[PDB]
Design a protein around this ligand. Structure first.
Ligand SMILES: [Zn+2]
Ligand SMILES: [Zn+2]
Lengths: 1032, 124, 62, 62
């Protein structure tokens, strides 16, 4: 059609006949540079060293790469600012350092400083210009009395790292220029605002023709004015410009339709704290983005910008002190908004409950003392699913709403609604919203308006949405082209109304109006947000998953010992600052890019050796605190190899030992190679090739292994996905798995305590798996411990546990509580859940029985039914993923020597499973005097569990316990305290240890603040309460 | 035990049993055995199950407790969660359909004097 | 609004009629778009003077 | 086979004299003033870029 061919003419007119005549080049500047391929130094220490004499600045070469990979080049620019400058026009430098266009935050960047150490503005691929004079006769401070000036530019020659492709770029500074980026004559230019407005109008108009339909007369009244204008603009006669704009004005002022939506736009750039670059680079990225944000708050007023991740604010505070006081000046104004008080945008499903609570707490604490703000909602646009315990934690932490967008990438199903009420397992509900643009980084195009209005899933009762724009995922922020195409879409009949705003006001009014409109028809979602994509993120880099749990499972012990030692010994200083530093370092390695393990080899290498260092430092605070208890109770008892595991079967926080102390375990070797372990409580029969093939529960007398199957068979899948190698698993892999039928028992023995051990070996073509199966006296559980020497890439290992019990749903655990997922997947959407998360245990049960499996560091599994060889129902298979080896961002990921531990239990109720999980995840310590816990609850009914006894953060000396219910039934208990804190009071708080109550949340205590000894507790299913004990 | 003198067409009657126990799935019975169906319907396909069959009883239970309702001749019901006036979780509502009066193939269907019997139990 | 109205009109209680119309009013008064066409309507009936009937019938038809 | 390009135009004969001609965009003289006819008239009119004015006949005809 004629119009579609007229759109191409208009776009080419924009690109060649209008765009170049915006920056009129006046003069070019002399340049000299100094290169450095090493690690960068602080800019302030370089400038003052670069002002006196101590740098030479050998001139650059036009047409050659100005740096090396992962290096820094400092450039001294000197211009002249000649006279006869155009009147009423702005003057600005233009830096064209060989930019590409596709990745904004990916390849090279830069930052321009003044000759005192102060930032001017950052330089990015699509935003490369620096204001000298502002079209009003006022100059920047870096201008002499004459036209002389001098600028320093720190340029980062970051390589462009492909997402999924084998490369050597994400390892270390190479010292070579792999991708060539030229220099090409930094220069000075005058800006023409009228041509720039004309280009903006053309852009707005021509982008609306691709998205309208040829049925409204506006499609034709537009395409006529677009044609009349470009037929009138002759770039060789400037006086025609004023004629061309008047033609493209009879259509720019048309009031929006009556029923059009209303969008609240705010500037937002998402910065992945570590992904495709080292963590030593994110600091500069935050600096650049923030500087860009403030240089756009003087192009126009009423522009708003949001920023999350208090850790980014801290990084900014240390590197650019001057750029911090400019932010605070905008915060008090109201145009700069910090949102979602959290340390970093953590992962949404893997961290435990205490991780999330501590993230919220540290974030709220930083946002208070520094910026003085109190956020009202959780900002989490990018995450691989959400745990389902989030609503309760958010509501009990003072929050009011919630924000997500990542759940659009699901491979099978689309969620029904965009704005809805999300109810967790407890019952508390939070208002949640997805930005209808299906992405956080928009460019404020006409395509995005058309999509937002034509995709919004609740247009019948909401007509209100949010809209984020800016260049994200690597920084950069929004560009001044986006802001000046927003004023065109303010009314613009044919498209949604758009206006600036803050998130809190949008959320308040949107929720209240949707409520008062819908009635008791408000959309609702109960449960978790299962992410139907990126299944391999549960096991991508195993040393990160093992590190997140081992460090956090022992922070519990270290913090508990600080409580016990601060009550026994009269002089013992609890090291608050070291613990705070360790906690912040931990919360930084739970970002949504490094816990899933989908970053470059460099990032994981640094994050891995941090776990080693903080693990070591933690087990010195422990032994130094235990030394204090050892002198306070000098003659009670001391045991080596103790494990303080919360919620045991008899004594909750007593430090139990490793010596089992039962009667020996009789072992009956058979002649064919098989063996028979038999303690008082189990009768295990191990076959000739590992693989326990029958397990009797001698108490009840039930087989525990599904017939014609063996427990412990190893499979190795062949996973070579289409895209996102380190991210997701094909379903095809589940078809290709091959068992390792070869194998044998290496050794059968008994030990000093009386337990029996069996040592097995297994191999697949290069690598070796040696398992140790243990049976201890007086414990109704079987323990497995495997050591892997993984060497072959592109493979995936997992073990299976065939259970002799058949049910319709499987039971996992959440951060606080439990969930169930189907076993046999019926519909198309259910088959998308073929692999799922599991914190610390999975249970398959029925009305009166059940079998459970608890793990140490795995985090991943999948369940399916089992059918006998005569085709009758046999049981259920539970497979849990151990280690995978991708190749995309990390060529040499997960090579060599992984450990794994797990255990299998017969459990009618859920209490012994929780006890076994807690007891397998606890760290070991030495020379620990055994003394009763200070806080104890006697269970009158149900199963309440005290999780995280710890000290107060106010330094006052109070105790804070975080107790919940872990069975799904109401629980009644009462508190008993030891003889070291009698006379103390107890009271109820929120998760942040503050006296704040909420009318829509039940409480634990009955009454108010009363005596601790004897206070009773009632807990409705999956409730999370926090007790605070004070001396008075 | 209810005695109805139904006279008005184009209407549908049902009684409700609000239970003080909250769970994620409801329990009905089949010809031989039991099944469970969701209570809060999440996806588009689940909201299509807003009314279901129930032979002789419906049970809402948890790990250690449960409440049940058994009927004489009803065959129909539906379940949904209940939210308190301060907007905290309260329990579950069990409504069971008693008598309807269509008009299409039968102009004078279900007019006058129906009986109904049912019972409510606490059952672990 | 179409759904809210027909859910409110009960033909066995006339007083509900006034309730049903008010629901189908929040959408009846919305000013036309800016670029919408303008049509000039006039009543017109075409009479074929003789086709499928005798000409002695067209007179009565007129 | 073919659809004419325009609905409103200048028709010139063999002599050279011209007359202004218009087709009703509803593509029929007997309309019933339905929403279908409005939608069709506005979505079929072949000169929406420079005319935005049309005629509309309604009634039971033929
Ligand atoms: Zn991200
Ligand atoms: Zn005719």
């Amino acid at each position: 059609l004629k119009v579609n061919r007229e759109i191409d003419r208009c776009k080419r007119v924009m690109r060649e006949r209008v765009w170049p005549h915006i920056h009129q080049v006046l003069a070019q500047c002399t340049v000299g540079a100094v290169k450095n391929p090493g690690e960068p130094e602080m800019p302030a220490a370089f400038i003052t060293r670069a002002v006196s004499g101590q740098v030479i600045f050998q001139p650059l070469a036009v047409g050659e790469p100005w740096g090396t990979s992962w290096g820094t080049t400092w450039i001294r620019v000197e211009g002249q600012l000649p006279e006869t400058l155009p009147e009423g026009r702005a003057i600005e430098l233009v830096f064209n350092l060989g930019w590409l266009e596709w990745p904004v935050g990916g390849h090279i960047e830069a930052m321009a400083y003044r000759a005192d150490g102060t930032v001017i503005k950052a330089l990015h691929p699509r935003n490369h210009w620096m204001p000298l004079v502002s079209a009003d006769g006022v100059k920047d401070r870096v201008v002499n009395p004459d036209g002389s000036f001098v600028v320093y530019v720190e340029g980062a020659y970051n390589p462009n790292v492909p997402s999924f492709t084998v490369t050597e770029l994400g390892t270390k500074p190479t010292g070579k220029a792999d991708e060539r980026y030229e220099f090409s004559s930094i220069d000075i230019a005058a800006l023409d605002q009228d041509m720039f407005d004309y280009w903006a109008d053309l852009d707005v108009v021509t982008g609306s023709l691709e998205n309208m339909n040829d049925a409204d007369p506006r499609y034709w009244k537009l395409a006529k004015a677009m044609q009349r204008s470009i037929n009138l603009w002759d770039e060789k006669d400037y006086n025609t410009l004023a004629l061309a704009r008047k033609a493209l004005d009879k259509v720019m002022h048309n009031p929006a339709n009556a029923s059009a939506m209303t969008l609240t736009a705010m500037g937002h750039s998402h910065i992945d704290s570590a992904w495709l670059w080292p963590v030593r680079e994110t600091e500069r990225k935050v600096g650049r983005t923030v500087s860009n944000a403030l240089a756009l708050m003087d192009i126009d007023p009423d522009f708003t910008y949001v920023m999350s991740a208090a850790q980014h604010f801290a990084w900014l505070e240390e590197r650019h002190p001057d750029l911090f006081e400019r932010v605070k000046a905008r915060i008090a104004e109201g145009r700069f908004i910090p949102v979602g008080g959290m340390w970093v945008e953590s992962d949404g499903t893997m961290p435990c409950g205490e991780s999330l609570i501590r993230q919220i707490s540290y974030g709220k604490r930083y946002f208070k003392e520094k910026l003085g703000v109190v956020p009202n909602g959780i900002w989490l646009p990018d995450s691989f699913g959400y745990t389902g315990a989030w609503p309760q934690i958010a509501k009990r932490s003072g929050y009011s709403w919630f924000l997500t967008q990542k759940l659009c990438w699901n491979d099978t199903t689309r969620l029904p609604h965009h704005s809805f009420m999300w109810e967790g397992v407890d019952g508390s509900q939070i208002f949640t919203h997805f930005p209808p643009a299906d992405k956080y980084d928009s460019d404020m195009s006409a395509n995005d308006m058309a999509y937002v209005q034509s995709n919004y899933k609740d247009k019948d009762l909401s007509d209100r949405g949010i809209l984020l724009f800016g260049y994200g995922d690597g920084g950069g922020g929004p560009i001044r082209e986006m802001t000046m195409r927003e004023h065109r879409f303010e009314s613009f009949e044919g498209m949604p109304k758009v206006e600036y705003g803050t998130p809190d006001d949008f959320f308040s009014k949107a929720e209240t109006e949707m409520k008062a409109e819908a009635g008791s028809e408000m959309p609702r979602w109960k449960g978790e947000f299962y992410f139907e994509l990126h299944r391999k993120t549960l096991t991508s880099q195993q040393e990160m998953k093992r590190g997140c749990r081992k460090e956090e499972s022992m922070l519990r012990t270290v913090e508990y010992l600080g409580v016990v030692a601060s009550l026994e010994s009269a002089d013992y200083v609890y090291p608050t600052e070291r613990i705070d530093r360790i906690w912040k370092t931990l919360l930084l390695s739970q970002f949504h890019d490094i816990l899933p393990g989908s970053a470059i080899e460099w990032a994981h290498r640094v994050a891995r050796e941090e776990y080693a260092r903080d693990l070591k430092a933690l087990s010195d605070i422990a032994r130094d605190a235990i030394a204090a208890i050892a002198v306070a109770n000098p003659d009670v008892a001391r045991i080596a190899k103790a494990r303080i595991s919360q919620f045991a079967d008899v004594d909750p926080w007593r430090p139990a030992s490793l010596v089992s102390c039962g009667e020996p375990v009789e072992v009956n070797r058979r002649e064919d190679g098989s063996a028979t372990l038999d303690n008082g409580l189990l009768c295990v029969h191990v076959a000739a090739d590992g693989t326990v093939d029958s397990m009797i529960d001698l108490k009840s007398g039930r087989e525990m292994v599904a017939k014609d199957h063996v427990m412990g068979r190893y499979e190795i899948l062949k996973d070579e996905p289409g895209v996102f190698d380190a991210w997701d698993v094909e379903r095809d892999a589940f078809l290709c798995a091959t068992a390792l039928a070869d194998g044998h028992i290496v050794s059968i023995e008994t030990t000093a305590d009386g337990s029996a051990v069996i040592v097995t070996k297994n191999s697949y073509r290069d690598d070796e798996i040696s398992t140790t199966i243990t049976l201890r006296p007086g414990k109704s559980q079987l323990d497995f411990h495997a050591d892997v020497e993984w060497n072959v890439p592109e493979k995936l290992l997992k073990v299976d546990i065939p259970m002799a019990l058949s049910a319709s749903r499987a039971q996992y655990e959440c951060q606080y509580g439990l969930i169930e997922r189907p076993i046999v997947k019926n519909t198309e959407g259910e088959e998308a859940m073929f692999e799922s998360c599991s914190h610390r245990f999975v249970r398959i049960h029925d009305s009166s029985y059940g079998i459970g499996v608890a793990n140490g560091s795995t985090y991943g599994s999948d369940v399916s039914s089992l059918r006998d060889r005569d085709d009758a129902l046999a049981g259920t298979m539970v497979r849990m993923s151990l280690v995978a080896a991708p190749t995309a961002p990390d060529p040499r990921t997960d090579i060599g020597h992984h450990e794994f531990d797990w255990t299998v239990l017969p459990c009618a109720s859920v209490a012994p499973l929780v006890a076994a999980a807690g007891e397998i995840n606890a760290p070991t310590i030495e020379n620990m005097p055994d003394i009763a816990a200070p806080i104890t609850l006697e269970p009158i009914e149900g199963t309440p569990v005290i999780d995280w006894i710890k000290l107060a953060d106010d330094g006052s000396g109070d105790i804070v316990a975080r107790l919940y219910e872990a069975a799904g039934a109401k629980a009644k208990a009462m508190l008993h305290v030891g003889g070291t804190l009698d006379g103390w009071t107890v009271r109820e708080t929120n998760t942040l240890e503050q006296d704040e109550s909420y009318p829509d949340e039940p409480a634990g205590l009955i009454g108010g603040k009363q005596q601790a000894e004897g206070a009773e507790l009632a807990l409705n299913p999956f409730q999370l309460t926090t007790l605070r004990l004070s001396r008075a």
